[PDB]
Every structure is written in structure tokens, then in C-alpha cells.
Amino acid sequence: KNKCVNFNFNGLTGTGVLTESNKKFLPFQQFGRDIADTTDAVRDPQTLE
């Protein structure tokens, strides 16, 4: 967390700082998106947050 990284979630590769989100995704949602259609936020596949 809080460091810039080459992340990859389930094949969703990218560059970013990662942080804990107050955003509450539904169980059917694994990813979120920007108005620009970039992957904004992610639900982690091993720890459900």
C-alpha cells in the first residue's frame, strides 16, 4: 500500500499507488471505473476488501 507499483489483479495489470477504499462494491462487482473508462478500484481476490 501507499507506494507506486506494477500491480496485477487477476490479469488487470497496471501502474499505480494502491490504497484502502471507503467505496462499497456489490458482491457481483470486482472492479470500478473512471469517467474515462480506466480501472479505478478493485476488490482483492484473497482478502475481501
Binding site: 469517467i35 474515462a36 473508462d37 480506466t38
Partner: protein, 49 residues
Amino acid sequence: IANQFNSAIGKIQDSLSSTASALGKLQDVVNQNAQALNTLVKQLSSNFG
């Protein structure tokens, strides 16, 4: 003549409190930039075939 001028400046207080309608010319300019920035941002979602 001073009472006319002082009255007339008094009416500018009321006009500029009550509405945006006169400043709409500056509103149009900031709004056009916001619209164009948001368009160039939304075009990132274009799949282009």
C-alpha cells in the same frame, strides 16, 4: 448628481446578488472549457474498432 450615482451603484448590488444572468458571458467560457476537457477525457473510452 452624487445621489444619482450612489443610487445607481446601489442597484448594481441588487442586480449582482439576485442572479448569475449578467455574468453568463464568463460562465459560458469556463463551461466550454470544462465541456471540452470532459469530452477529451470521455474519448479515452472510445474503442475505435
